[PDB]
Design a protein around this nucleic acid. Structure first.
Ligand code: MG
Ligand code: MG
Ligand code: MG
Ligand code: MG
Ligand code: MG
Ligand code: MG
Ligand code: MG
Ligand code: MG
Ligand code: MG
Ligand code: MG
Ligand code: MG
Ligand code: MG
Ligand code: MG
Ligand code: MG
Ligand code: MG
Ligand code: MG
Ligand code: MG
Ligand code: MG
Ligand code: MG
Lengths: 146, 172, 149, 257, 129, 144
RNA sequence: AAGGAAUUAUAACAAAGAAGUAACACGUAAAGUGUGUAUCAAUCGAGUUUCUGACCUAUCAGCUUUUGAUGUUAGGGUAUUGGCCUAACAUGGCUAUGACGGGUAACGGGGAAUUAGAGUUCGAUUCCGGAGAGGGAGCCUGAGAAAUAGCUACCACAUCUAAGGAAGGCAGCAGGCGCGUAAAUUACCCAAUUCUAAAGAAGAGAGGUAGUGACAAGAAAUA
RNA sequence: UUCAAAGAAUCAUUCUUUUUAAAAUCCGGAUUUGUUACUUUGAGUAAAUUAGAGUGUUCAAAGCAAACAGUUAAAGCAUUGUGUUUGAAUACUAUAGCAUGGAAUAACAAAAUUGAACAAGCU
RNA sequence: AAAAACCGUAAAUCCUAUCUUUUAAAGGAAGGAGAAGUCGUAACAAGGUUUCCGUAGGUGAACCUGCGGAAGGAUCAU
């Protein structure tokens, strides 16, 4: 079932009647997956299929959640240097990202996300490329320096 | 009013330290209706006027298959994926499905070739044809009348049309 | 020692020469077959190795056959789902639990049971991290007894 | 209320104005115009601190009032009009012609120049718009729109632009070995040939510019101003000829005098 | 348990020097340790050493010239920038005229002076006097 | 072993322990607890003005034998009653039983000084004339 | 024709469609200027926004979600993005790497003091940014204000009044009372530095100059 | 988990050149090969302060000026007229972000109840 | 134009509630200081019952006693 909303999920930029489905390239060498080019699914905020251009930062993360609809959480784990102790310390930050159903992403999977406009109250990113990866504890606890 | 005054995602109260800066303007909704035309001008930022349609009728409606358009009175609102209240109140917004007085399109067709620039070959749907037979056809609105001040829209077609019919479906 | 205060160093230590010694007549295929037979007969890896060392003339299956014995078992397809050491630990735990059930006041046993559980959880975790265990495998004190078979 | 800022504080003034800390509280605040305040220079500074024709702002204003100072050949009476990187100034009474250039430090000098060469000015294009009637217009660092520019002109290249009439003479592509001047960080006066351009994907396109002492230095492509083909510059450069010496070398030079 | 083989080895060496041994059995050899030993040899502090290959982590035995005052690791292998070096060396080693402060540097392991000559600082292994 | 962790990525522990432990330092605690402003007459100040309430004697610590001349004063700032020792060979009588005294610390932050038991304050101006000046006498005379 | 990437520039077709393109003023230059004007670009900027970065407290451990908390859809609104707001639907989101509270005698930063090197403390205060004009809130004008020597209202102060009404907001400059351990003249001027204007020629407590000044800082008599 | 080896200069040491495997690319010759940390170079940053260059504010704190030639002209350079040389450097502007050379040290990724590399054939 | 109605911003006032912060209070019960005050002698020596621990009960007060510990014992010893 494609049309799940009260409205008709169309795909802006499609052009149905005249001409010789719509996707774009997004750039920075991130290959548009098969599932975007083939495989109907409408998404306003897909990098490839929709109308959001990714631009600004690109940062790899590691997914913590799939619980939201078409939306993912990724903790960036990183090292904050403290000059007093000339040592580091694990620190982190949970970036919420928009997904788009071209990417089937279970937790612990590495992703890379480009920036893009403010899509919601907190989701300013969308996932461009999903490496696979496997995890055994909780993704919560995996440090992957990156 | 476009601004903060809102919890912090962790659910912590943002203790506010800033009034309301005018560029965070949230001026109130024009619930634009049917009727004889009547539109006010609101003065947005750099003298950028925008046209609060408050009553409307004679929007520009397109026929996508043939890629043409005509100005018609719009005779009723019949669905609103936002909420049914709006449709009850007969309020036009940017994805309202409404009914056009659809004689104009028919007339155009007659003028061009047959009876119910030219890449004709498509030659109409069954459902659409049926609709035309009663005079009055379902059509999305596509302008945001509250901003733009026009009820510009387009005729609903094939799959989308079917879906909307299903949604409408009566039944009990 | 991981848990006691034991600090002993009793150990096998293999000889410098790791290309098989001159006197070893057995061709690899035969030894493989023997290993397979042993496995079938109910022996576990370590036990099998011991048997090979003692009953037949062969020091180390690694010098005769390029592969180690677990690997060859795996190849032949008679590898246990549940690894040797882990299995043993589980068995021990089960035994302890039975005793506890029988005999509630044994404090030392309980303490030791906890230790064995902990060790299992370590070992278990390690196996999960590889792919010998499935990720869906907690060890349960209720189930445990059934698992070993 | 809160809108734009009309004043400029004399310490917050951009260093290459070379103002005082004393000698005032404020600075002139370039009018909006054809140049970015941080890389421009108002006419006041030129008149008063560089040429020293005026002692005061008042004198500068007076001078301007006589319609005698032209910047790119059309007059200006706005004391704080920004002059900027390449622009020819024609002080009419002396019959002096200056062209603004950079020193080997960050500083603007007024160069002094002939009638003949004065009639043109170099201008680097930045954007190349399409507009109505599929006519292309280049937009120069001089905040000036050149319409109907020759199609082979691309986004970074300079253009020799006439002043008497708005039309262009010739253009110089942004090539691998094109004589270049700089106009921003560290290596600002520097003049080189170009060795290599990086052409990073999402980022700033960094370029490496070999000098005539063969000292390579890098720079953003943003702030590089094409000035020639490998052989000859299309403008008269200052005495130093964009050869930013080492510190030690400079000191030695100073000593030998 | 072991953590830093190298540190342990260095400690052992120091102990040997203190006693006034001659020979000394550095018990787990490591590429890094070997490199360190070589460096030491180069700057005269150590004699020959016969990295004996078992079929495991090797043993070294090392020939001492009665010449080392101390040698040591400085654990936390602090990244150290080229400008940051001087202060570190002041802190550590007894005189500017002598002693050596060994860095692992993307151009192999080498002493502070060497690093300076090169241009790259790196992570700081240890030192001797 | 050291006691402390010396890992490269140890910094969190190192910082955190220091943060907790700082508070064992008495001086640090004195500086950074909020009870300074609450529980102090001068309320974080050099001096304070207090009208006098009682000229009073205070017997010294056991080994020494004197009755030190103090003045129990009320701070105008704070409404606090405090004893302030008055210096000088005969400088209790230089002040009135109700005089606007300006009183300083004694030299040891809060901590009490010398022979005196629990008088942490040194009157050093009366009716705006300097107690020292009055003591010298060649300089000044108390205006009233 | 670009841009890493376009539903971009642009071109065509079908519909609507603002505003505009001088019913203006000088007499100039070597035919010029002022004023105005649609779109574009530049500029002076502004708004949002990415990442990273902060002090004390666990005698603050669970928070957030009817009251938008987290997301999806559709809209409304905005100059534009966005729970920014509405409706409908999910049940999310943050947290022992300290969420959420509490405290700060907290505006932030550039910096200051003091240090061999680390550091520790300070940073109201020359510049940049934020905020506020007694307290909240609300608007009008305008390119830009949620303006405060704009307005509306309430609260708290408070002035004149013929008692009907009326105006008022020094955290501008001086100056005064109060508070206080604790801080200067109701000075002269636009000359300099700048701003504003119908832009040399006017204004400017912006700014400067003196006055008070043992805050500091430097040089230096008393032979 | 690629260790090493050889030649030339200098006062046992220093700095330099050359080759010792495998794969892809280019007309037998010639040239690309995990990620991040780390490090090196850059780039880009307001000045004021700070360090710091120059400069006899009479010194100094300063400031960002100045110096030079002359009882009034020579000299230069300009085609009688025009002073001239100049200076207001440089470094600092995180711990993050940007590009960047990297051989060591660290991680991580790749990797057998089976994993991918070619040559042939069929779709 | 006034006036009105409805959403929507929404001051302010009042009522609770909760929290924070100073602050009163009969009495209670600590603490510290002082004064050659009363009662003992607890501890320091085998301190005149070795001391000390934890716990429980006791008692004007130091303290006493039980149980199990310790030597920081007065025993490094058959
Ligand atoms: Mg253990
Ligand atoms: Mg051992
Ligand atoms: Mg304001
Ligand atoms: Mg809702
Ligand atoms: Mg505050
Ligand atoms: Mg400040
Ligand atoms: Mg304050
Ligand atoms: Mg006030
Ligand atoms: Mg206001
Ligand atoms: Mg005022
Ligand atoms: Mg008011
Ligand atoms: Mg005042
Ligand atoms: Mg004072
Ligand atoms: Mg003026
Ligand atoms: Mg006895
Ligand atoms: Mg006794
Ligand atoms: Mg006794
Ligand atoms: Mg009894
Ligand atoms: Mg008893």
């Amino acid at each position: 079932d494609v049309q799940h909303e009260r409205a008709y999920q169309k795909q802006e930029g499609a052009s149905f009647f005249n001409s010789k489905r719509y996707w774009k390239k997004v750039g920075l060498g991130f290959a548009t997956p098969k599932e975007a080019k083939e495989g109907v699914y409408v998404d306003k905020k897909c990098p490839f299929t929709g109308n959001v251009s990714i631009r600004g930062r690109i940062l790899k993360g590691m997914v913590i959640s799939n619980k939201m609809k078409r939306t993912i959480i990724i903790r960036r784990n990183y090292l904050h240097y403290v000059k007093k102790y000339n040592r580091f310390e694990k620190r982190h930050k949970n970036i919420p990202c928009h997904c788009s159903p071209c990417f089937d992403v279970k937790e612990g999977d590495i992703v890379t996300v480009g920036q893009c406009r403010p899509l919601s109250k907190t989701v300013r990113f969308n996932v461009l490329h999903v490496e696979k990866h496997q995890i055994f504890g909780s993704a919560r606890k995996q440090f992957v320096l990156f | 009013r476009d601004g903060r005054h809102k919890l912090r995602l962790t659910g912590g109260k943002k203790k506010i330290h800033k009034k309301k800066r005018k560029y965070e303007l949230g001026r109130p909704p024009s619930n634009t209706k049917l009727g004889s035309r009547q539109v006010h001008v609101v003065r947005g930022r750099g003298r950028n006027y925008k046209y609060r349609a408050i009553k409307l009728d004679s929007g520009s409606f397109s026929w996508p298959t043939f890629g043409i358009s005509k100005n018609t009175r719009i005779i009723d609102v019949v669905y609103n994926a936002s909420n049914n209240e709006l449709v009850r109140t007969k309020t036009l917004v940017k994805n309202c499905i409404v009914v056009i007085d659809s004689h104009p399109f028919t007339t155009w067709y007659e003028n061009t070739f047959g009876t119910t620039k030219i890449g004709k070959s498509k030659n109409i749907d069954p459902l659409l044809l049926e609709q035309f037979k009663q005079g009055r056809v379902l059509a999305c609105i596509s302008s945001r009348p509250g901003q733009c001040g026009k009820a510009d829209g387009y005729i609903i077609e094939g799959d989308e049309l079917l879906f909307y019919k299903r949604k409408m479906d009566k039944r009990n | 020692r991981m848990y006691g205060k034991g600090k002993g160093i009793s150990s096998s230590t293999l000889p410098y020469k790791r290309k098989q010694p001159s006197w070893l007549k057995q061709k690899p295929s035969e030894i493989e077959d023997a290993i397979i037979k042993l496995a079938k007969k109910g022996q576990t890896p370590s036990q099998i190795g011991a048997t090979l060392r003692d009953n037949y003339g062969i020091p180390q299956v690694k010098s005769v056959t390029g592969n180690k014995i677990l690997r060859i078992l795996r190849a032949q397809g008679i590898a246990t789902t549940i690894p040797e050491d882990l299995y043993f630990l589980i068995k021990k735990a089960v035994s302890m639990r039975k005793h506890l059930e029988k005999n509630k006041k044994d404090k030392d046993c309980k303490f030791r049971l906890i230790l064995t559980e902990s060790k299992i959880h370590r070992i278990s975790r390690y196996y999960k991290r590889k792919k010998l265990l499935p990720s869906n495998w907690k060890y349960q004190s209720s189930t445990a007894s059934a698992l070993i078979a | 209320g809160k809108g734009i800022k009309k004043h400029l504080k004399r310490v917050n003034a951009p260093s290459h104005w070379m103002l005082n800390k004393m000698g005032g509280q404020y600075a002139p605040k370039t009018s909006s115009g054809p140049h970015k305040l941080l890389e421009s220079i108002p006419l006041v500074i030129l008149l008063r601190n560089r040429l020293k024709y005026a002692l005061t702002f008042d004198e500068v204003k007076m001078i301007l009032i006589q319609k005698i100072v032209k910047v790119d050949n059309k007059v200006r009476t706005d004391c704080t009009f920004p002059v900027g990187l390449m622009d020819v100034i024609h002080i009419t009474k002396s019959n002096e012609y200056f062209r603004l250039l950079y020193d080997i430090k960050g500083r603007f000098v007024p160069h002094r120049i002939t009638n003949e060469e004065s009639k043109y000015k170099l201008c680097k294009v930045k954007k190349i718009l399409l507009r109505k009637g599929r006519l292309s217009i280049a937009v120069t660092h001089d905040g000036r729109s050149i319409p109907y520019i020759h199609p082979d002109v691309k986004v970074n290249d300079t253009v020799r632009l006439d002043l008497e009439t708005g039309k262009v003479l010739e253009h110089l592509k942004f090539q691998v070995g094109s004589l270049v001047m700089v106009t921003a960080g560290h290596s600002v006066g520097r003049v080189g040939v170009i060795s290599s351009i990086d052409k990073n994907m999402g980022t700033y396109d960094i370029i490496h510019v070999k000098d005539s002492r063969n000292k390579v230095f890098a720079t953003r492509l943003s702030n590089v101003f094409v000035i020639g083909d490998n052989t000859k510059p299309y403008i008269s450069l200052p005495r130093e000829k964009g050869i930013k010496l080492d510190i030690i070398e400079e000191r030695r030079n100073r000593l030998k005098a | 348990v072991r953590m830093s083989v190298l540190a342990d080895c260095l400690k052992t060496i120091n102990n040997a020097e203190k006693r006034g041994r001659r020979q000394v059995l550095i018990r787990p050899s490591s590429k890094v340790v070997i490199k360190f030993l070589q460096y030491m040899q180069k700057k005269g502090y150590i004699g020959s050493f016969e990295i004996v290959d078992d079929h495991r982590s090797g043993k070294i035995v090392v020939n001492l010239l009665g010449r080392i005052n101390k040698c040591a690791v400085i654990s936390p292998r602090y990244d150290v920038k080229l400008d940051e070096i001087e202060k570190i060396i002041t802190s550590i080693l007894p005189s500017r005229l002598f002693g050596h402060l060994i860095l692992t540097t993307p151009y192999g392991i080498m002493d502070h002076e060497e690093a300076r000559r090169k241009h790259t600082g790196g992570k700081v292994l240890g030192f001797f006097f | 072993g050291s006691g402390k962790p010396s890992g490269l990525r140890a910094a969190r522990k190192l910082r955190i322990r220091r943060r907790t432990q700082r508070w064992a330092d008495k001086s640090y605690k004195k500086s950074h607890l909020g009870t300074r402003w609450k529980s102090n007459p001068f309320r974080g100040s050099s001096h304070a003005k207090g009208i006098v309430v009682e000229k009073v004697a205070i017997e010294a610590k056991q080994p020494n034998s004197a009755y030190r001349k103090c003045v129990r004063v009320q701070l105008i700032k704070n409404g606090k009653k405090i004893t302030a020792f008055v210096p000088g060979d005969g400088c209790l009588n230089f002040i009135d039983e109700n005089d606007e005294v300006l009183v300083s610390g004694f030299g040891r932050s809060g901590h009490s000084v010398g022979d005196l038991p629990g008088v942490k304050f040194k009157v050093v101006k009366v009716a705006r004339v300097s107690l020292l000046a009055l003591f010298k006498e060649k300089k000044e005379k108390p205006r009233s």
